[PDB]
Structures are given as structure tokens and as C-alpha cells.
Assembly symmetry: D2
Homo-oligomer: 312 residues x 4
């Protein structure tokens, strides 16, 4: 196509508008070089581990960006402070590879990240990451499945880019995504049904055998956060992964799994709560703390929310 709208052309132009520096574009642009290289590596996984390559690659591409200064990773005890020569204004929390275990089974998997603006004057620190999900600038995810695709969420909107493998570029394909209001799918790992605190099980039964003599919802759980959420985004529905007994505080870590998806959901018009408060409104204390999460088409989450405040 002689006028393809890459991610870079899309980013740079909204950047043109904030009358800023060009760092987000450097950051995003470098980030996508990690994504292509990981997409490529997941598509030949096992022609002869991974998540450590995956982590190295994204830390390196982000350091060279000349735009970060604290990078928080799934795979690292402590957060990373970018040499002064390479610092810039962003904090990126990311899980490089989420659900790495799944590659054997051939499950769709992904990278997830969120970018905070360091607003403070002192030395880069763990504290610059301990900012509420509400404050995020940009957040999104990279998905590796039949097609590699990037949903990027910024203050103006949610957009899906798709990697064209011929030209190694991400092309803008669906614009200004908004979710279906109520939907027909519930997603939860039902093997913990003996654990689902009584709000959930209610809604589970209430949807399977709908006592309103309605069509039951279908259920789906691919078991890789990213495919479950992407699906919830496009076809509408609800995904849930709440505080159960193996996992009393949810499983999904906050700064890099729960707050990006959340941010993406609300920008798209979905909601995402814990059933006790908003995922994005939490004030993190630990960079690696976890969350119960429930996100998806607003009425369904509103439905499960009635039940949470109709059971205490």
C-alpha cells in the first residue's frame, strides 16, 4: 500500500500534538524491535530459556531508547535504573513473556507494559513506579498468535496495530476500539470452583443456567492472560481472576499485568475492578504486588458488582 500508517507514524503524530520531545516515539519504536524479535522467536520455538532472552531483549532496547529511567520487570527482583547517559522521562513496567510455560501447548502468549512519566525531581527510584494505574500515559500489549498484534492504549484511544511480516512494520488496522456493552462470555479458571468466594459462584450459576430464562453465556479460558483479554476486548464479555485460596491476592501482579489491561479496558469503555475497588485506583506499595481482577463489558462487570455488594 503506498500510504501505510505504521505505529511510528501514528505515535509521532499524536506526539506532534503534545508539543513534546519525541521520547515516547523512541520508546515505542524500540519496544516494537523487541516485539518483532520475540514474535519471530516464538514462531520457531522448538526447531532444534525464552523468557530470559525475552527480558534481556526488552531491557536493552529500552535502555537504548534514550527515554526511560526506571524499568520494572516480571523477571527481576529489583527495578532497573538506567545509566544517566541513557536516561529520559519514562517508567516502563513490563512482563516480557507472559505465560511462557504455554509454548509447548502452543497457546497464544504476550508481552505487557505500562508507561509512567516520572514527575519528581530526585534520583530515579522504585518509588517512581509506585504510582496508581490511573496515572498511566500509555499502556498496551503485544500478542503472539496467528498474527502478531499490538493493542496500544493512549489518552486519546485504544488502537490495534498488526505486524506485517513482509515489511516488519506494524500497521494500524482497527481504530478507536470501544467494547460491546454487555456480552455473552464469562472467563474464569473454573478448576478453583471450590474456592470462588460467594459473589463469583453466584454469578457463575446465574449465567450458566440463567434463572431469567435466558441464553446461558458460553465460557472460555485460554489460560494465558493476554488471549483471554484480547478476546474480551473484541467480542465483549468478561474475564475474571479473583482472590482464590492458592492465590488469596489474585495471581496477576499489579504494575505490569493488572494495570495495563485495566487502563486498556476503561479507555475502551470496559471497566475493571477487584469487586472491592478499581484496579487502576490502587496505590501500590510494592512494585510486584498482585490483584484480584475482573474486567470486561461494563454491564457484566456491573452485574458481578451488584452481587459483590449484595453478599456482605
Amino acid at each position: 500500500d503506498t500510504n501505510i500508517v505504521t505505529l511510528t507514524r501514528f505515535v509521532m503524530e499524536q506526539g506532534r500534538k503534545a508539543r513534546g520531545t519525541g521520547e515516547m516515539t523512541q520508546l515505542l519504536n524500540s519496544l516494537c524491535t523487541a516485539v518483532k524479535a520475540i514474535s519471530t522467536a516464538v514462531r520457531k520455538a522448538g526447531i532444534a530459556k525464552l523468557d530470559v532472552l525475552s527480558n534481556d531483549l526488552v531491557i536493552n532496547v529500552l535502555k537504548s531508547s534514550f527515554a526511560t529511567c526506571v524499568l520494572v520487570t516480571e523477571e527481576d527482583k529489583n527495578a532497573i535504573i538506567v545509566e544517566p547517559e541513557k536516561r529520559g522521562k519514562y517508567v516502563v513496567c513490563f512482563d516480557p513473556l507472559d505465560g511462557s510455560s504455554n509454548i509447548d501447548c502452543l497457546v497464544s502468549i504476550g508481552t505487557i507494559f505500562g508507561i509512567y512519566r516520572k514527575n519528581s525531581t530526585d534520583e530515579p527510584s522504585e518509588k517512581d513506579a509506585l504510582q496508581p494505574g490511573r496515572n498511566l500515559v500509555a499502556a498496551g500489549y503485544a500478542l503472539y498468535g496467528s498474527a502478531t498484534m499490538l493493542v496500544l492504549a493512549m489518552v486519546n484511544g485504544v488502537n490495534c496495530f498488526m505486524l506485517d511480516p513482509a515489511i516488519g512494520e506494524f500497521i494500524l488496522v482497527d481504530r478507536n476500539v470501544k467494547i460491546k456493552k454487555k456480552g455473552s462470555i464469562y472467563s474464569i479458571n473454573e478448576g478453583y470452583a471450590k474456592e470462588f468466594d460467594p459473589a463469583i459462584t453466584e454469578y457463575i450459576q446465574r449465567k450458566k443456567f440463567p434463572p431469567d430464562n435466558s441464553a446461558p453465556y458460553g465460557a472460555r479460558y485460554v489460560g494465558s492472560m493476554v488471549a483471554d483479554v484480547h478476546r474480551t476486548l473484541v467480542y465483549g464479555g468478561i474475564f475474571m481472576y479473583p482472590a482464590n485460596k492458592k492465590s488469596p491476592k489474585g495471581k496477576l501482579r499489579l504494575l505490569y499485568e493488572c494495570n495495563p489491561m485495566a487502563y486498556v479496558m476503561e479507555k475502551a469503555g470496559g471497566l475493571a475492578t477487584t469487586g472491592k475497588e478499581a484496579v487502576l485506583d490502587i496505590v501500590p506499595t510494592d512494585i510486584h504486588q498482585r490483584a484480584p481482577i475482573i474486567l470486561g463489558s461494563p454491564e457484566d462487570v456491573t452485574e458481578l458488582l451488584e452481587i459483590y455488594q449484595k453478599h456482605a
Copy 2:
């Protein structure tokens, strides 16, 4: 990278066609299915920067024919079996759904091409009828998976072998020889949306996995909602994937012929007796080319634990 000695499926299955003198008719056929399988996957990867199931079907028909190894073909998305227009004939019946879950692409869920292949027992004319051999007289079955990778798993009589498309050269090279599914698992796989309609044998089965009666580990659940997704996970890692029957689809949704069946041969040939509930899926003399028939498959002990309940409530 840059390897001098790689077992490409053509080279692989050919080391099978000649040592056992089984003409390598298998080859030509398969080779062509590899060109279709690949071409479809390219398209699915650029999917939304460019139906499909239709064009996918037409391309599989069309390439198959020219492999000179067919006489009968059966699709999901087709009428009476196609009898090969006649010059390009040979001995096989390929029955297949080229794009399983053809909706699911747009939600970026993984989808596949299945195939069942038979050899012609009739020395009469190709008639749609010939398609209708039952399971256990199948020469080769497998699938292709358009996922994070394009994996074709082939199950012939000696065993199931998984394969993977190396995009850099366009070959399905080999990564798992004589695949054997595990003996017992931790996954039950079923669409529990339909929990009203579920026959009390499966409801017991679910209740024993979820809540184990003997106080142990709950079986974790997992249902992608693509038939080819759920079998592969269930194959390589091991589980009970169950699309039984229920009022909403009273004799299953899965068109036995090229779905429950091709899968099942891949299942049993690695340790997985795929049942209906009453009869095993391969012994069911095929009544119609799109005749449907319910299916619970997977690794041996999980099947069994349900068949006991099946045997105790009828």
C-alpha cells in the same frame, strides 16, 4: 542455522513410503496438503490487513486433486463428496474441514485444517458412498494448527509425529517423533456454559474433577473454543477434552466424519481412546458425509474414569 541434514516431512514420510513399498502415493498427496496448509496460515497471519474458509476450501480441493492421489473428497463446507474430475485420479478419500472455527480469527484465537484419509476399497466407480468407510479402516489422519507457530501433527499407523513450519524455508520440519500422550492429567476441557443440558454422567465427571471426592487437587480447566486448540493442548500435555452431546446439539456438534474422527485416530494412535460415550468413535459405521457424533477424548485414564460413570447410569 544452516543445517545440512533436516527431516522435512516429505523426506520423513518418504523414508516411510519406500521401506514398506506403500507406493509413496501418501507423499504426493500430503506434500500438496502441505502447500495448502502453509498458504492458508500466511493469509491468517496477515488476516486483518488484506470468506477465508471458503477460499481455504477451494484451495485445499484444488491442490488435492492435482496430487494424483485422490478419487473422493469430503469438506465441512460442501455438498455430496466431490468425486475427482476424472483424469487426476488415484486411490484416496480425503475428508477434511479446512478452517475450523473460521470466526475465531477475528478474536485471534488459534484455528486449524483437519484431514482424514482413506484408501479406496471399491474397485467400482468413485461414488460418494466410498467416502463412507469407518474410523478403524483409516490410513492416515492429522491436523494443522495456525497458532503462535504452524504446527502440523501427522498420525499414521506407526505413531503421531508433530511438525513445525520453519518460515525461513517453507518446510514443516519434525520436533516430536512417536508421540504418546500422558497417562493421566490435570485438565478437563468442556464448554460449561451449557451446564443445564449436561447429561448426569458428565456432570458427575465434572464434579469429581472440580471438587475431587477423595480430597486432592482440583483439575484445572481450559477451553480455547477451537477444536484444534483443545485437542493439541490435550494431546501434548494431556487431558479430557469433552464436547459431549446435549439437547442443544442432540448427537454432538462435531461432524464425525472429518472432525471427531480424524482427531480420534491421532488420539488413539498416541494412547487416547476417543469415545462417544457409548461406542468408540472409530467403530461407528459412517451414516452420512457430514454425519455428526459426540466426542470425549484424551489420555487413557481420564476417558476411562468417565466411561465407568457412563456404564453406571444407562
Copy 3:
């Protein structure tokens, strides 16, 4: 994009192996050469972000063998012809240089795999000797070109067909059927660095192209310096490509057997009598598996204009 009906060389040549009952042994063989040809090209494209000729040879040997269509193989970069280690036997002699101009990569010039294939006239044992059939008893010859595209041109007995690697699916699909070279051209192609050593027949030939005696157009010159470059340009557009003999290489540089020869069959089968100067290159009973023999090829009239001078200075 997304085409339901594409003539992949396997499908193509197979529509040739069965209508003429010529066992499709041709196929298996070729198909395997396609997997080598491709794999090498991937590597050349990432060349300098990763010898080669060696590994290229080993991979071509190794894939060939498993096509079950060989008994004798001859390389540039090899000793006595390899006799196939014996289980994988069949009827053909493939003689080939896998990486022609193997230096030229680093200057990013285009390079290729040639091949000559024969069928075994001996009902005795595979002996290196069997390799040694002359040109005119060749069953199929062609080359592959690692250029801006990977183009394999195949010349069998019915004609030359050019092919092109669609990287998106890994097939050499077809773009030029029954290729015929032009009758006369505007290109003379020779390494005039060596203008000292040039035998007075070629020096006349050059002087008639450069300066046309009859006051007309100077023949434009073009010499890539890769044998596979110079033939393709000379084939599709038409010219006289001449690596004659001279003191520095007294009976040519091009190892007749798998170079001047495989090219020449592709030449004559599209209108191009490739000569030595004295005998035509296909009639020369092959004295040794790397026996060299000079070559002037191309379209008919240009060859002729030189053979007259060849016929008038001896």
C-alpha cells in the same frame, strides 16, 4: 493474494510425470532439490549477519540422497562421483555446482546452484563411470538464481520454464512457460580483461559487435561475472555470452560436466546452440567428472555469426 489455483513446480512437473507415465521419479528428486535450493538462498540473504559452498554442497548431497531417485552424484567441490550409499537408490545421476561464484556473495553479486540430471544406462553397479554420459542424453537440466528474487529455471525436454520463489509460502511458482530465447541480440558478454589471450576469431567477433563493420548499433556489453548471472540475462533478453578458452585456462575454466553442460541443455532447449567453438557442447563425450570445456552460448544467430569466423581461421 490468496489464490486457489497455483502451479507450484511439484504440481507442474507432476502434471508432466503422470501424463507421460515417466514415473514422477523426476518429482521426488526435484522436490528435494527445491528444499536445498531454498534453504541456501535464505542463508545467502542473511549472509553477512550469521564456507557456505561447502555446507551448501553437503546439504544438496544429503537431501538428494533421500529423494530415492539417485545412484550417482557429481559436485564441483568433490572427488570421484558419490555413489549413493546404497539403500536410497534409484535411477539418476545428478551432477551439480551448488555455489557458483561462492566469493561473489561478499560483493553482493548474484550466484546460483546448477544441476544436470541423467538417468542410469547401466544395469551394472553404480560406478563413477556411469556419471560420464554426454550432453544430448540428458533427461533434465536447470539452475537456481539467488538474486533480487530466487528464480529456478528448469529445462526439460518440452521446454524451459522459469520459476520464482514466493517467500510467503515457500514454493517456486511459475512465471514463464515454454521459454524461447530471442533470435538475435544487442549484448556480447565476455571478460575482456583477458583481451591479450583472445583467439583471433573472438577478437574479430568483439570488433564486429563494438564497432559494427556495417555502420549500425554497437552491441552493448554486460558481464556480471557469475556464470548464472550472465546466462539468465543472456537467456531472457538474449545475447552472446562467451567464456572461450585462452592460455590462462587452455580448455576453458567451466567444468563442462555440471557447468557448461547443464546450462547448454537449458540453452539449446530454448533456441541456443551452445558451442565450444569447434564441437557443440552436448556431443562431447565426457572424459572426466570435472572435465572442463570452453563455452560460447546464447541465441542462435549470435552463436552462428561467431561459428562462421570459427570456420574461417582454423
Copy 4:
């Protein structure tokens, strides 16, 4: 490789050093999106024209760069003035596809370009392009052959990048290229031998039968500027395309064929002249004017230069 040095990472960092804007990086980066897309299109040319796609694509990618303001093309009568909303400080003269005719024959072909800095205060104009080749900021070429490869020439050096097709990124492979001093190859279209003005023919014979009882040079002419020059660069040698009688002013247009290669040659330590003056020192009057050119390993060009001033 978990720390690949892309072109962007290389550019951006030398840009870090001029304490500038980031526009060259935008320009180069956008330019490479044209190159990938053209490489891809040349590699499937004829599975069923081109240079018009090729031109459109590069003009569009350059307009969106937010860094040009005059773009001069092989395929356009008049130069192009970039809408004010999208102007920035660079002038890029480019031939998008050089030797397009050749694709049938399967010849290695390429894009060529040169980037001037508009120094003046008034409205962008044709005159901002009429600047001596000596003034160029950056220049280089993209080559499409067995591998697609970008040689980029900037004030600090000549570097070869190579496109990795897996990840769609250009990787820095040979650094700070310098040519061999004298070399063994002469390149000229000898079919014009009845036209070669007496300096050339001398040197032609002087090299073929070397009267110094020396080894003759080999000759090569692929007939696509770009493959000939790339080869001259790496293996050393000389390429020549002088004023002949069909073409009394050379054939190769100045601003986009002769001055980029020239610039690349000298930065690499080669020379390039007309045999009457330096190619880069010419003051163009026409944006589309042509040149006799002779460039390559210094001694060889010095050799042919003796002869030019030993024959008048």
C-alpha cells in the same frame, strides 16, 4: 541477538552527539520503511509499474517524516514542496529505482538519495537543492540483491547495514568502511568503445594488456549503477561512465546518482571526478543535470587522471 544494533540505534546515537532535533532519525527511519517495502516488492516482481509505486512510497514516507521540505525525484519534472504542517529541515534528492528495466533480467538494482540541510531563511525552493555535493550531510544507497543492504554515509564514516528479514530491521554489519587503495577491476560499458574519448581507451588498453608486463585487470559491468558501485566499494577497483556521444554529458544525473555515490566514495577514501573536476565540487544549476563520473580506489582514478592531463 539480544543487543542488535539497528540503523535507528546507530543514527539516533550519532544524532545524540550533534545536540539536535531527532529529524535525521525520523527521515532515515521513514526512509527504511520505503526500502523494506520495495525490497519485498522487488523479490516477488512478477508473481501474477514498479518505479511509480516506488516513487510514491518514498515521497509519502518522507512527507510524514516531519523532517523534509524539498524532495527531488528522478521520476518528477519539478521538485516537491512539503506542506508547512509537515516541513522540517532536510532536502532529499533520491532516485527511487534505479535501473528498473533490469528486473526482467534479475539484475541487482537500488534506491539512491542525498540529504541537504536547507540553510536559508526563505520559502522552500528548487534552489535549496542546487547545492554542491560537497555540502551533503548524509547520503547512501539501498541495494536489492541476494540480500537487501543499506550503505549510509555520514560525516563520521561509511557503514553497511543489512536487512534482517525475520525482524524487518537493518542491522549494522560492516563498520567504517575504507576502500582498497589500488584495485584489480575496471568497469565501463565497453559497447561505447568507439566513443571513449582518448583518455579512457588509453587506460582501457593500458590495463587489459598492461605494457608494464603486469596482470591485466578483470572487467565487470553489471549495468545497474548501484551493483557496480557497491562492488567498487568493497572489492576496490574503478567504475567509469563518462561523457560518450549518445550521452555527451554522462548519463547519470547529478543530484541523485552522481553526488551520493561520490560522497560515499570519498568518505570511504575513494575519489570521484569527471576527469576535469570533482563530482562533489560542481555547482549545479539544474536539479536534473548529468555527469560524467569515474570513481573508485584512489590510485586507479589517479591513474586515469594522469592520462586525462597527459592528453591535452
